[PDB]
Structure 1
Amino acid sequence: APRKFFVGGNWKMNGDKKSLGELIHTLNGAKLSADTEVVCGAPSIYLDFARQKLDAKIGVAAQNCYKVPKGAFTGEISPAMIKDIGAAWVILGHSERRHVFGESDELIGQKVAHALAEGLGVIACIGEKLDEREAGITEKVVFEQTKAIADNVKDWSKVVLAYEPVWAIGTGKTATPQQAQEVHEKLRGWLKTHVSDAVAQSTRIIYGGSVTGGNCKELASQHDVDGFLVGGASLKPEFVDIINAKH
């Protein structure tokens, strides 16, 4: 269908209730266009607080979950917890978890299927490493990632794909609209070819490299990028700028 601009605010391990509410206040208060779908992903202690403070206009996403509703999982929260609280999205397969917490493609795939079954929308992340990029293996990886995911979705309608060149954000660089456009174009083409063009055309593929207030227009501008997974910049008023990018 005629795919809606999506913008995700990934707060990571940042903020406290004071600082954050300030954020939210500023948000709640800002002028943003529909055209753009917005969602904030808060640290879990903050989730409820945030759903509470955030306007219905704005969706709330948990930055991770597990694939079982209950149990002997010390330290984990469940899709049902998430839901309980009123969040409706879970960010999954994030680079930091893939890489610092060693989450597997299998493990991620199961979180996707569980999250879906439980009725929460998902923004799933793929991306290659500098060395992956440099070996000339980007495609293979990003595709491996993506199928792992795909093999687990039943319903692409509560699904967003976030392409994150890991390879890039903390090492300087680019993630030039052009190198970004390219992966976006092949993914979509992948999906097309391994799923359906129906799916291919309904799914929002958001750009997740280092987006900014300066940046965004240029990226947004591109043909196959449907939005962004925003990090650092999601913590400042600049996000409004990003939200209202395509414009």
Structure 2
Amino acid sequence: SKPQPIAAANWKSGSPDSLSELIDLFNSTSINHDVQCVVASTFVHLAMTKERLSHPKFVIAAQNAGNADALASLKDFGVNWIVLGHSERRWYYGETNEIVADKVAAAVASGFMVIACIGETLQERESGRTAVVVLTQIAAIAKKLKKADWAKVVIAYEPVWAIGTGKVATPQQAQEAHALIRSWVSSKIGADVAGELRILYGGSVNGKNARTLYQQRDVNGFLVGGASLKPEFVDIIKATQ
């Protein structure tokens, strides 16, 4: 039915010691279903996790790449997944739809599994421009990808207003945005591709809200920030059953 789900952690902060305790918990956790778990972080924690994380279902990812040289070095360092187009890169650092599109194409060429992020601001949401915004973002990425490349792409839909604010989208809001993105992909690229495509939801996900969100027809997992620094991340992974 639904493609293999992904439960990605976005370690935006935390201390080396507290984090290794988490890694121990994960390593000792049996997941009785097929799900790809991803732990994304910065150089600070990347060396530790790359060596301390042993769970068969987990993989590590870099939080961003500034250029082709970094993609190359990261690849050599042994990192195969990467998160691109995350909120702040777009609104704080000014990366345009075109720029992240180029980054996504480059990463894929270098052989990475890419989690490309998209989402609208509170202003856009309220102005009723969600659908146009989201599709423009996704369209920019598509313009640079060859049909084969989609095999290496995961889309993460995160309303900018839901990230770190405590304000999660509703099962209906998420499902609608995801359904829209999938439709666009199906009609523009192919239904074969659209069906294989994982579209994750990110924006204040936690152990208590995950299942309802996951139950939606078009939600294939989550990109989790805050709750991924806590052991409740385990409940979030179990919610992708």
TM-score (norm 1): 0.92
Find the residue that maps to 1:133 and give its secondary structure. Answer: helix
Aligned pairs (5 A) from 1:108-147: 108-147=100-139
Match of 2:44 in 1: 45
1:123, 1:160 within 8 Å by CA — same for their partners in 2? yes
CA-atom RMSD in angstroms: 1.5
Find the residue that maps to 1:161 and give its secondary structure. Answer: strand
Aligned pairs (5 A) from 1:5-16: 5-12=5-12, 14-16=13-15
The unaligned stretches of length 5 or more in structure 2 are: none
Where do 4+ consecutive residues of structure 1 move more than 6 Å?
Answer: none
Find the residue that maps to 1:101 and give its secondary structure. Answer: coil
2:27, 2:55 within 8 Å by CA — same for their partners in 1? no
1:164, 1:208 within 8 Å by CA — same for their partners in 2? yes
2:26, 2:55 within 8 Å by CA — same for their partners in 1? no
Find the residue that maps to 2:239 and give its secondary structure. Answer: coil
Aligned residues: 238
Find the residue that maps to 1:122 and give its secondary structure. Answer: strand
- The Cα shift of 1:168 comes to 3.1
The unaligned stretches of length 5 or more in structure 1 are: 70-77
- The Cα shift of 1:48 comes to 2.2
Give the whole-Å Cα distance in 1 for the aligned partners of 2:162 and 2:40: 22
Given the alignment of the two structures, is residue 163 of structure 1 paired with residue 162 of structure 2, yes or no?
no
Aligned pairs (5 A) from 1:63-212: 63-69=63-69, 78-154=70-146, 155-169=149-163, 173-212=167-206
2:104, 2:114 within 8 Å by CA — same for their partners in 1? yes
Stretch deviating more after TM superposition (194-203 or 39-48): 39-48
Stretch deviating more after TM superposition (190-199 or 43-52): 43-52
Given the alignment of the two structures, is residue 32 of structure 1 paired with residue 24 of structure 2, yes or no?
no
Give the whole-Å Cα distance in 2 for the aligned partners of 1:161 and 1:206: 6
Give the whole-Å Cα distance in 1 for the aligned partners of 2:67 and 2:144: 12
Overall identity of the aligned pairs, in %: 50
Find the residue that maps to 1:211 and give its secondary structure. Answer: coil
TM-score (norm 2): 0.94
Find the residue that maps to 1:168 and give its secondary structure. Answer: coil
2:2, 2:220 within 8 Å by CA — same for their partners in 1? no
- The Cα shift of 1:85 comes to 2.1
Find the residue that maps to 1:166 and give its secondary structure. Answer: coil
